[PDB]
Amino acid sequence: MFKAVLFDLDGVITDAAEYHFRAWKALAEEIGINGVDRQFNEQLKGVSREDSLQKILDLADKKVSAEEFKELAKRKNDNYVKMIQDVSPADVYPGILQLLKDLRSNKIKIALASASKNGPFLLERMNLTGYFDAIADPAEVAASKPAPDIFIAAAHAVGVAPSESIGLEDSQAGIQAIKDSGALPIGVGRPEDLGDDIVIVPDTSHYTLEFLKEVWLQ
Ligand code: ALF
Ligand SMILES: [Mg+2]
Structure with missing residues (x-):
């Protein structure tokens, strides 16, 4: 897993x-x-x-x-x-909280792999800090998405190889970055934007632990 x-x-x-x-x-x-x-x-x-x-x-x-x-x-x-x-907890997208709870309950590491300069602040305002094992610091990476650096850094930051990881992204450049890191991408959006060769969900309510597992197993 x-x-x-x-x-x-x-x-x-x-x-x-x-x-x-x-x-x-x-x-x-x-x-x-x-x-x-x-x-x-x-x-x-x-x-x-x-x-x-x-x-x-x-x-x-x-x-x-x-x-x-x-x-x-x-x-x-x-x-x-x-x-x-x-920003408050009500700004968290559908299904994301539940996913973070289930991930933490299954001892699956959670890392932020965002370009946001306000990541830590934003997670704290959304009450999500306790779920995050690490936040990759975008000030410390040499290159931005679609370069895989941020994803590589996020994986490393929780003590795993990217190849042990799933990446979640809504952008085509983010999808590329996850692929080139070695981790497995699951996009949210439409295949017209994100590519046709990866699993994609229509919205974040479809990001469940059971679904991630199925995709990893397939
Ligand atoms: F928070 Al991002 F691409 F880093 F939407
Ligand atoms: Mg995004």
Whole structure:
């Protein structure tokens, strides 16, 4: 049986993306840039803070110095951190808590494998810290998804090889990272986005221990 589960955060454990959207919308309102809506935000998902800012500036074909860029980036960050103070246990996606309980009950290690700079804070606000054996620090990895580094680090951090692990991800780049780590990916979303050659569930309520076991056994 697999010895660990390696969890992406956004789109697996919770909708962290929604808070990034509101922070971006709020900054854009403050500086008078139109068009930062839910559909434009589709183009910010899995994008770095700085690239996301640039795409926002591009809505107004606006030109700013390196200092101004840094300062807008800083304000969005301030915004986001202020907004996530309201994260609570009700933000945890369906089925995830139950899965973490069942994993812990079966002594299966649990690690976070997220790019989020606020991972530990977010898990604590969702009351999930006690389930996590480790959080891979994205500041300590050389390369981001789709490179497997974060997953490798998460597995190592709980004292297993990636090959003893299942990885859960909602992104195509995250799926690649899990494959290239050696661990077994199970996506959530649609095969159109994630690939056709891996097991995929439609939503997190389908991530059960029994299902993970079946997939590992198959
Ligand atoms: F939390 Al993620 F890719 F959604 F690291
Ligand atoms: Mg994600």
